[PDB]
Amino acid sequence: GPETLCGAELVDALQFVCGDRGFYFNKPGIVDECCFRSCDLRRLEMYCAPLKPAKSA
């Protein structure tokens, strides 16, 4: 998604992904991994709980 964004906007970047290629809302634990802070791109693809995306390369 971005590269730094825990000030709410994280959710829009997160929501580009989240559908098995990530979560779907009802699942929690996700926004959590971002707002451990220095929120992420491609660790974006490890915070919306995503597997394959572009995290892996």
Enumerate the domain spans of the chain.
1-57
The residues with which 19 forms a beta bridge, in sequence order, are 21
Q: Is 43 helix (H, G, I), strand (E, B) or coil?
A: coil
Say how far residue 41 (Cα) sits from the centre of its chain. 8
Give, in order, the Cα–Cα distances in Å from 55 to each of 26, 32, 47.
Answer: 23, 18, 10
- Residues in Cβ contact with 24 at an 8 Å cutoff, skipping those fewer than 6 apart: 18
1-57: CATH superfamily: Insulin-like (1.10.100.10)
